[PDB]
Amino acid sequence: VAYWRQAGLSYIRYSQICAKAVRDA
Amino acid sequence: RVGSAAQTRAMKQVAGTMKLELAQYREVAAFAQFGSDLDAATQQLLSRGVRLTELLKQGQYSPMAIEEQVAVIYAGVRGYLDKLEPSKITKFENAFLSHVISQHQALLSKIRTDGKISEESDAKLKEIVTNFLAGFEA
Amino acid sequence: ATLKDITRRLKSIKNIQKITKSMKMVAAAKYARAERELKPARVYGVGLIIGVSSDRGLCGAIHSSVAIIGVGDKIRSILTFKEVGRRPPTFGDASVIALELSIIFNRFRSVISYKTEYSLANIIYYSLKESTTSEQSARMTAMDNASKNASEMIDKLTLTFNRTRQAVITKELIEIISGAA
Amino acid sequence: SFTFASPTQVFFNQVDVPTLRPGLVVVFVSSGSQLLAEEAVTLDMLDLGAAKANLEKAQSELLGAADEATRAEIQIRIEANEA
Structure with a gap:
């Protein structure tokens, strides 16, 4: 299982963070 | 109906601009409180609008010399109060007028002796109004 | 009298x-923006109730036709998310709704006409982009x-x-x- | 046919795909699943001089701090920035 999915978290939060990191660059 | 023929040059140099801006404001004034998303151009007409309107308010028993009138009308017309909260303008003018009468009589005389607001007078009025505005709005 | x-x-x-x-x-300008944004939203779209409209009325039969969550302040006051419609919807709006978790929305046809995992957020977004285009047209009309x-x-x-x-x-x-x- | 879009822009109406996982697409994508991406961009628009600043800033919050799943969000931001 992926690290982010242990305490939390959804793939929706994954994509939300990744999308914002692209915009900020 | 006598109109401009009855005015001095000092008043005639500011009364025209004021008349036009208030006329343009009256067309838009009905939805001054019903236009949070309307464009900047009509937002500016409204902003200049109830500023000039506040400058037409006046207390009783202290009628003003023509040079004192144009110095306040010029300040609104040339845009120096557009960032000042509407509700504060009447109390601003009282303080401003007391200040110029007491300290800048030389300036008020220049608008009277020369019968208009020159570039020199314009520069001096800019310094006094802008710095005075920041102290008053605190 | x-x-x-x-x-x-x-x-x-x-x-x-x-x-x-x-x-x-204002609604004519808001619709103009929405119809432009709906074009790439539809091509993206191609691939519990709970009810989609907005916070603002004066748009005819937008809220009534679509009427426990509901996106739009009109949904809960007639029958929960606020502050929808005023600013055009984004995928971030769809994510917020999906994270807090058929689909009932107004589909855009023309200025006069409208009808009632990751793909979960896609469906909510699709309904949002259609809804506001319909709502802005309907408000302009009304x-x-x-x-x-x-x-x-x-x-x-x-x-x-x-x-x-x-x-x-x-x-x-x-x-x-x-x-x- | 091949369709490639973000929620806001359409690029296409062999395809190298990163698995989604932040990375390059050759016909930069953020995430998602026709190729669907939350943020899909050039390549001309990305900087990249500021992504290094973003990577270092994300690695600064990692040595925080601390509380789990916070944290897990910081690591995701590090993965997106490294790509």
């Missing part, structure tokens, strides 16, 4: 006429008609005012003449 009463109504419906016209114009109805009422009331105005003068004069004769 009486001149003072009509005077107040006339000032009221005159203000409404102006506001309704300005509201039509406000255009309201401003027209206000216009016709202003005319009708002004005519009633002036007939009453004339009748009052005539009646007063007839009483004066009768007393003098």
Whole structure:
């Protein structure tokens, strides 16, 4: 299982963070 | 109906601009409180609008010399109060007028002796109004 | 009935006429933006209730037609998310809803016509982009008609005012003449 | 046919795909699943001089701090920035 999915978290939060990191660059 | 023929040059140099801006404001004034998303151009007409309107308010028993009138009308017309909260303008003018009468009589005389607001007078009025505005709005 | 009463109504419906016209114009610009944004939203779209509309009324049968979550402040007040419609919807809006978790929305046809994991957020987004395009068109439409109805009422009331105005003068004069004769 | 879009832009109406996982697409994508991406961009628009600043800033919050799943969000931001 992926690290982010242990305490939390959804793939929706994954994509939300990744999308914002692209915009900020 | 006598109109401009009855005015001095000092008043005639500011009364025209004021008349036009208030006329343009009256067309838009009905939805001054019903236009949070309307464009900047009509937002500016409204902003200049109830500023000039506040400058037409006046207390009783202290009628003003023509040079004192144009110095306040010029300040609104040339845009120096557009960032000042509407509700504060009447109390601003009282303080401003007391200040110029007491300290800048030389300036008020220049608008009277020369019968208009020159570039020199314009520069001096800019310094006094802008710095005075920041102290008053605190 | 009486001149003072009509005077107040006339000032009221005159203000409404102006506001309704300005509201039509804001909605026309908001729809123009929405229809442009709907084009790439539909191609993206191709690939529990709970109810999608908005916070703002004056758009005809947008809220009533679609009417425990509901996106839009009208949804819960008639039957929960606030602050929708005023700013155009984003995928971030869809994510917020999906994270807090059929689909009932108004599908855009034309200016007059509308009808009622990761892909979960895609479906919510699709419904959002369609809904606002429909809502902005419908508000533009309804406000255009309201401003027209206000216009016709202003005319009708002004005519009633002036007939009453004339009748009052005539009646007063007839009483004066009768007393003098 | 091949369709490639973000929620806002359409690029296409062999395809190298990163698995989604932040990375390059050759016909930069953020995430998602026709190729669907939350943010899909050039390549001309990305900087990249500021992504290094973004990577270092994300690696600064990592040595925080601390509380789990916070944290997991910081690591995701590090993965997106490294790509």
